[PDB]
Swiss-Prot record, chains A, B:
GO terms for molecular function: triose-phosphate isomerase activity. Keywords: Gluconeogenesis, Glycolysis, Glycosome, Isomerase, Peroxisome. It comes from the Eukaryota. The keyword Isomerase applies. It comes from Trypanosoma brucei brucei. NCBIfam families: tim. This is Triosephosphate isomerase, glycosomal. One of its GO terms (biological process) is glyceraldehyde-3-phosphate biosynthetic process. It catalyses: D-glyceraldehyde 3-phosphate = dihydroxyacetone phosphate. InterPro entries: Aldolase_TIM (IPR013785), TIM_sf (IPR035990), TrioseP_Isoase_bac/euk (IPR022896), Triosephosphate_isomerase (IPR000652), Triosephosphate_isomerase_AS (IPR020861). Its EC number is 5.3.1.1.
Amino acid sequence: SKPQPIAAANWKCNGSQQSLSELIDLFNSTSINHDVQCVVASTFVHLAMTKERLSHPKFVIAAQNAIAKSGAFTGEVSLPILKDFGVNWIVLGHSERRAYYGETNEIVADKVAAAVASGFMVIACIGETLQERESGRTAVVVLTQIAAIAKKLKKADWAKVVIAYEAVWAIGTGKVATPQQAQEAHALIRSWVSSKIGADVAGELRILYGGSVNGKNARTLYQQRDVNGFLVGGASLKPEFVDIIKATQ
Amino acid sequence: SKPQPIAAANWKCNGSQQSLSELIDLFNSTSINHDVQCVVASTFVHLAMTKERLSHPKFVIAAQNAIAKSGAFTGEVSLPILKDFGVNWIVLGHSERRAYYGETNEIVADKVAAAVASGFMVIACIGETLQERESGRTAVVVLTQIAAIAKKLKKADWAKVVIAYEAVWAIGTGKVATPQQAQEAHALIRSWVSSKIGADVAGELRILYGGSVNGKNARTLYQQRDVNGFLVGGASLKPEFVDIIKATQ
């Protein structure tokens, strides 16, 4: 049977204090009558306000990135700073950081391992580009990405890990994975984990889909066997994020 | 006469809420009897606290980095978000970001121009490494860095710019540039601005020194004709930062 689902709002590099305050008020009023972990990943600047204003007990706050250690890293935020700030969830390896900000499979893996060692719950992101998908390389790309993560973890660490599978080619392009595409990617991931890490870990692992999830398409994705919730970008800045939450019943 | 000096604290990726709040308490209680712009550049997470707590009229808050626009840039903070948050100073092109985080001369220049267009005061950092210095390439490296920044600015924009010359081989290593080394680098930078931009702009520009500035060495550096204050890393996390402020006369 499925583990507790997750509905993760990745606000990306967006928001004003007023627009996010208004959105948080809507989140606080949503009536959620099943077990689902909701996650709001704000920019670093907005963590203070989001922590203060977000009070719905089924929601937690997350960061969108970090580096492993404090020190002479002008502009970056470290895991200990986030831990001191009361943030215990983090998104790492997002496709935009892999593309834009130098995060290779190994750099992602090392960030993930450092965040687990610090005590975080980690949404570790993987996923293939349009060119990878079109040329038949989805499986080798996704498996290589997760193998790098696994290399740096031990079996018991997986209790603190969530995988987000991103159809990278669906982000911002007017495309979306079909339920069969999402299912086949999640099933591949899960089977690899079962065989490399253990059947017990694989059954408990949450694997989330990202790439144009919205209030209308969420239920049809969620009802697939190996989908445990969503990594939501654009729709998480909108009232219909609550419909995405409701789709994980 | 020299232009108004600047004492800039670059906390880098350091601090707890409590340890930084205690530094702010010290700054708030400090008596300063000359004109000096003090700047506190904290991590993004700590901006809310510093905005609420810092009250000294000679101090402003700053960010340590940004990207130009909001959007699908997971993990980053943009200029519009900082502007909405009430942050009007920013450090850009710091040596650590040039080294670790992909910031070429051109990326630094484009960030600086975007910040100036968005209304910010900008501390734009340049400086050569140990290998560049040992190779005799200090002049070509530093002049090429500032030339890239200047290509994206207009004459009027220099009123919003401050240059920080970092002796990169002196960052964190506890061995400061001698007075003569700093003065010669600063005089070279100014001569460029004078020739390329104008004698007026050159004479008003603040050129700050960074690299192991501390309470004990700051006054002697400040006596040099082309030094207009300091970009302070390690000592800005310590009580002696106040002595570095007092040294800017």
